[PDB]
């Protein structure tokens, strides 16, 4: 009965400045890897002793991942800014929570893929890992475009894939 | 391993 989580959030900056991005990783309700944007040296850091052994290539790779996520989140907050017809004189936030639950057998029990905006539930992946649950007007658009682009199977490719193996890989180091 | 967002919306 183990789990794994990733909380990646982005917040728009007042006036005229680049938004703040963060990425916190959890393994069995324990923070293990962390990232921030406005830090002096924006990189990924291990939050537990067990991680430090990992090679530098791992760190540079996941750092590039983080940068790509910065750009991604930027484009998406501009997008959602356009969706809800909002002016640029305000501050908003976007959250992405993606994780996995693994049973006693070691095999994946429940995959998690949730996107929220401004403290409200935006779009969420379902237990079947194929469909989408959306609430309001702007979310149905995302659901359509992702039904045509086949997003559920990509996020399923990650969830059933790397998430599990890396989770076990971390559990072995504890 | 962190995931890549990949898809805009």
């Amino acid at each position: 009965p183990h789990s794994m989580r990733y909380y990646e959030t982005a917040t728009s900056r007042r006036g005229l400045g680049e938004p703040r991005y963060t990425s916190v990783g959890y393994v069995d309700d324990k923070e293990f890897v962390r990232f921030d944007s406005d830090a002096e040296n924006p990189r990924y850091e291990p939050q537990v002793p067990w991680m430090e052994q990992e090679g530098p290539e791992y760190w540079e790779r996941i750092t590039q991942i983080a940068k790509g996520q910065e750009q991604w989140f930027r484009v998406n907050l501009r997008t959602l800014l356009g969706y809800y017809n909002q002016s640029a004189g305000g501050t908003h936030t976007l959250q992405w929570m993606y994780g996995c639950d693994v049973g006693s057998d070691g095999r994946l029990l429940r995959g998690y893929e949730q996107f929220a905006y401004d403290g409200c539930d935006y779009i969420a992946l379902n237990e079947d890992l194929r469909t989408w649950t959306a609430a309001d007007m702007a979310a149905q658009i995302t659901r359509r475009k992702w039904e045509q682009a086949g997003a559920a199977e990509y996020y399923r490719a990650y969830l059933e894939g790397e998430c599990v193996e890396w989770l076990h890989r971390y559990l072995k180091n504890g | 391993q962190p995931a890549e967002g990949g898809f805009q919306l």
Partner: T-cell receptor
Framework: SVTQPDARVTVSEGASLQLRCKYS??????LFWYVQYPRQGLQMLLKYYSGDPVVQGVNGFEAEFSKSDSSFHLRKASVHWSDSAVYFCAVSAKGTGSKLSFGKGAKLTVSP | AVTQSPRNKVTVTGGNVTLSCRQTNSHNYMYWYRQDTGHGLRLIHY???????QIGDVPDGYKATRTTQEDFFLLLELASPSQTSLYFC??????????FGEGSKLTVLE
């Protein structure tokens, strides 16, 4: 890297078609097929991330993925003269999902 | 759609070339490829947003520049006949799902 057996293929019009494609990644990558008609850019024919190994594509194109043989074979029930193009198989490693890698490409000539 | 410029170009060795790539739909990922005989096509450069770059499979000889989200440039400072090729630029709002340009045939002469 992606390996496509033949660069030149010739088939009579109104015949079955299978274009083969094998990759070299142990960890199953994202799989893709693309088409290049003469004097044109490349168009995505079909894609595969996870789930159903049989992927349906536009214009009657299909692709079967074999985890066993690490295969991703393109298939079409019947070919026409309009289907004369160069077909590419593309992959992207896990983590480097937006980084594609194309095969040599198979020039498909369909004798009408 | 995705528009690249110019469609065709002929230059001499040591000449300066610059290929332009503009998209009308604000996709983020942008690509620069070249298609050769017996090599299919190979990734020269690519970018995951404005003001950023990333090295492909064959970066030697080619420098790139991403000024905006919709403008990607592939620069060629020192021209060589080994760089005589057909260059395609691409865009993507999805990992692996690319939108290719019209094409840019270039020939370099000694």
């Amino acid at each position: 890297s992606v390996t496509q057996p033949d660069a030149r293929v010739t088939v009579s019009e109104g015949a079955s078609l299978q274009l083969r494609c094998k990759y070299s990644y142990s960890a199953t990558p994202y799989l893709f097929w693309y088409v290049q008609y003469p004097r044109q850019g490349l168009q995505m024919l079909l894609k595969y991330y996870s789930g159903d190994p049989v992927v349906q594509g536009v214009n009657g194109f299909e692709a079967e993925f074999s985890k066993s043989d690490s295969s991703f074979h393109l298939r079409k029930a019947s070919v026409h003269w309009s289907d004369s193009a160069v077909y590419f198989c593309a992959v992207s490693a896990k983590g480097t999902g937006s980084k594609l890698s194309f095969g040599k490409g198979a020039k498909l000539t369909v004798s009408p | 759609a995705v528009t690249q410029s110019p469609r065709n170009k002929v230059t001499v060795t040591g000449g300066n070339v610059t290929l332009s790539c503009r998209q009308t739909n604000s996709h983020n990922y942008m690509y620069w490829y070249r298609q050769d005989t017996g090599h299919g096509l190979r990734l020269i450069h690519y970018s995951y947003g404005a003001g950023n770059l990333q090295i492909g499979d064959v970066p030697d000889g080619y420098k790139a520049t991403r000024t905006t989200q919709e403008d990607f440039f592939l620069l060629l400072e020192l021209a060589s006949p080994s760089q005589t090729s057909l260059y395609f630029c691409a865009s993507s709002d999805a990992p692996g799902q690319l939108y290719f340009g019209e094409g840019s045939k270039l020939t370099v002469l000694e």
